[PDB]
């Protein structure tokens, strides 16, 4: 996988929701990661590594 | 307010289990203490152990006194070893001569001889004799305490109380559990006389319906009082002073106990600093750290403070020795003692330089002759040095195979060989039964066939009878009848055996 | 279910063979359990004859020996 920054989205793992869940990721050659994402309930969330 | 930090963080610790964080969080609580903590803590330890050496005066109980140990040290006509360097030794407020000692040990023996008979004078603590005792003490107070042997002298008082105290418990073990007994009454009159049976009826004056039934064990209750009594016989004093002496040296040593703690807590960050310099991946962190802590303990245990220097460095090199020793003793399945270790270390330091300069690994001869020792020892060191290899290592590139699969038990047995031996034995005693009974049996005991043991010329003979040389010739003719190319062929196969 | 029907068994050695051994040994240990070798699996481990096929004829005999002392 190349470095940089990628986007994607999952098909409602809360299949209860059955709704799209977007998220986004960075990738360096070296160091630490990040992950941005939506919850089902319309809020942004973040996690390192 | 560092315990308050523990309060909150523990209130929401994220289920931590690492003791590293725990220990560092704990030691970070108590902060450093510098440039006067050293001295004032040393002076508190001074106060404690010099309260002790004040307590060390006036032992009618421990009559075995440095006078007596001074008779000991010169008992075998001489000593200049360090037993005297712990003795009296006035510091300015070094093997001692006989002249100097006999001079120093004369006035304290003078106080000894004058101070005892005056204790009789109308009271054990009579003011005149008691100030004579005070002279004995205060004369001893400019002089210093004396070495580890004095622990015995303290223990020689502990063993008193170890008995005395215990005997009261022992008397209580016969007294207070079985029947009812008061305790607001018992202690007061137990303090009252303590010497004769006088408070007995004084306590029964309440008429105590339980007390009159003092039977069927009382020949042990009073014989347990009799153990206390024969101790009063042994010692010679009804103690109230030497108990106070026990209190004095108890607080005097406890002073030190409390004291050098905060010297321990003062200097732990020093320990982790040293250790994590030494944490080159030999063993592990925490055991090294704990070893640094015993390090620091014995560093403080014998610290001169009037050298003016900072505690840190003295302690530091003692710590270095502790850990660099223990890393050597441990960290291997194979104990390699120390001198081989340091040889290896030296050697590798050398070979680094050699491969700077030669652009190559070195040759054993070269760095050996530089290291001034012959090739054999080098070669053996190299044969010895490498570690074991972890049975469960995956010789398989993937998890298809471990190394523990591809070895064999090259020790145990082999079935064909068992059958070989069995058939051989059958053939052998089949051959035996063809020959005479006495001869074959004599050979069985000669060679241990069909029995546990083995016997020889004279044993087997004199079991049968005395003969020696014709016995030899008898087994010879046994071979002659046995060589016999009709019987070999059942055993000719076993010539390959 | 299948897997827990297998686990929740009157013995445990078959149970302690394919899934989550740890829990099984723990629960069995406290109670003072004991198996009596009625299945196949357990009789295979030890190496005895199975109570089946050619071997039913012998294990029935040992059962009446449990009856007959």
């Amino acid at each position: 996988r190349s470095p940089g920054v990628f986007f994607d989205s999952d098909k409602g793992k809360t299949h209860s929701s059955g709704k799209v869940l977007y998220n986004a990721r960075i990738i360096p050659y070296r160091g630490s990661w990040l992950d941005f994402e939506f919850d089902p309930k319309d809020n942004l969330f973040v996690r390192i590594d | 307010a560092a315990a308050q930090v523990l309060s909150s963080v523990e209130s929401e610790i994220g289920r931590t289990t690492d003791p590293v964080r725990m220990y560092m969080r704990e030691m970070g609580t108590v902060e450093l203490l510098t440039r006067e903590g050293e001295i004032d803590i040393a002076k508190r330890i001074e106060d404690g152990i010099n309260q002790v050496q004040c307590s060390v005066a006036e032992y009618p109980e421990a009559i075995t006194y440095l006078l007596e140990q001074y008779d000991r040290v010169e008992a075998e006509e001489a000593r200049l070893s360090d037993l005297i360097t712990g003795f009296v030794d006035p510091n300015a407020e070094n093997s001692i001569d006989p002249e100097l000692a006999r001079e120093k040990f004369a006035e304290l023996r003078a106080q000894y001889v004058v101070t005892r008979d005056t204790i009789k004078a109308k009271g054990r603590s009579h003011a005149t004799a008691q100030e004579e005792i005070l002279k004995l003490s205060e004369v001893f107070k400019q002089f210093r305490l004396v070495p580890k042997q004095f622990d015995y002298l303290v223990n020689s008082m502990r063993v008193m109380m170890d008995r005395v105290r215990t005997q009261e418990r022992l008397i209580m073990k016969l007294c207070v559990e079985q029947c009812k007994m008061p305790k607001k009454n018992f202690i007061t009159l137990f303090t009252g006389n303590e010497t004769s049976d006088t408070w007995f009826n004084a306590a029964i004056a309440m008429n105590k319906p339980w007390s009159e039934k003092l039977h069927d064990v009382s020949e042990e209750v009073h014989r347990a009082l009799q153990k206390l009594q024969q101790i009063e016989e042994e010692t010679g004093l009804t103690i109230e002073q030497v108990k106070d002496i026990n209190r004095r040296m108890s607080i005097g040593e406890a002073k030190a106990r409390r004291a050098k703690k905060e010297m321990v807590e003062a200097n732990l960050r020093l320990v982790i600093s040293i250790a994590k310099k030494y944490t080159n991946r030999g063993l592990q962190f925490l055991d090294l750290i704990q070893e640094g802590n015993i390090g620091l303990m014995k560093a403080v245990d014998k610290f001169e403070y009037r050298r003016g220097y900072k505690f840190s460095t003295y302690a530091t090199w003692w710590i270095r020795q502790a850990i660099t020793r223990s890393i050597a003793d441990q960290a291997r399945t194979i104990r390699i003692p120390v001198h081989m270790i340091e040889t290896i270390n030296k050697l590798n330091r050398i070979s680094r330089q050699m491969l700077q300069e030669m652009g190559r690994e070195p040759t054993p001869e070269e760095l050996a002759e530089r290291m001034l020792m012959p090739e054999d020892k080098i070669r053996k060191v190299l044969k010895i040095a490498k570690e074991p290899i972890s049975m469960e290592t995956p010789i398989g590139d993937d998890e298809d195979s471990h190394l523990g699969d591809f070895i064999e038990d090259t020790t145990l047995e082999l079935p064909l060989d068992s059958a070989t031996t069995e058939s051989l034995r059958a053939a052998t005693h089949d051959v035996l039964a063809g020959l005479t009974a006495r001869e074959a049996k004599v050979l069985r005991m000669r060679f241990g066939i069909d029995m546990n043991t083995d016997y020889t010329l004279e044993e087997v003979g004199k079991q049968f009878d005395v003969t020696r040389e014709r016995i030899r010739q008898i087994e010879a003719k046994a071979l002659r009848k046995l060589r016999h190319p009709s019987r070999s062929e059942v055993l000719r196969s076993f010539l390959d055996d | 279910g299948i897997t827990k029907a297998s686990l929740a068994t009157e013995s445990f050695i078959s149970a302690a063979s394919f899934q989550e051994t740890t829990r099984v040994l723990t629960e069995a240990a406290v109670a003072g359990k004991r198996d009596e070798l009625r299945g196949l699996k357990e009789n295979v481990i030890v190496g005895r004859l199975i109570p089946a096929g050619t071997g039913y004829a012998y294990h029935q005999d040992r059962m009446r020996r449990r009856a007959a002392g």
């Binding site: - | 001489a78 200049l80 070893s81 360090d82 | -």
Partner: protein, 72 residues
Amino acid sequence: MNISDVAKITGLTSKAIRFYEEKGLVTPPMRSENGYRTYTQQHLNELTLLRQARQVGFNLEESGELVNLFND
């Protein structure tokens, strides 16, 4: 005393000295609490005699007799 000092004074070594000692040919120096062979001047000059006697040629036994005379 310390032991190497005495042996470098007199030229011997602790090993040879301890051989002589086990032969019972000099005063036994006491030890210390640590275990150092407590030498003296008597031990020093007795050792010097026991050295120079075999140099002269008086053997182990005979040099020991010279020593026990040195005490006498």
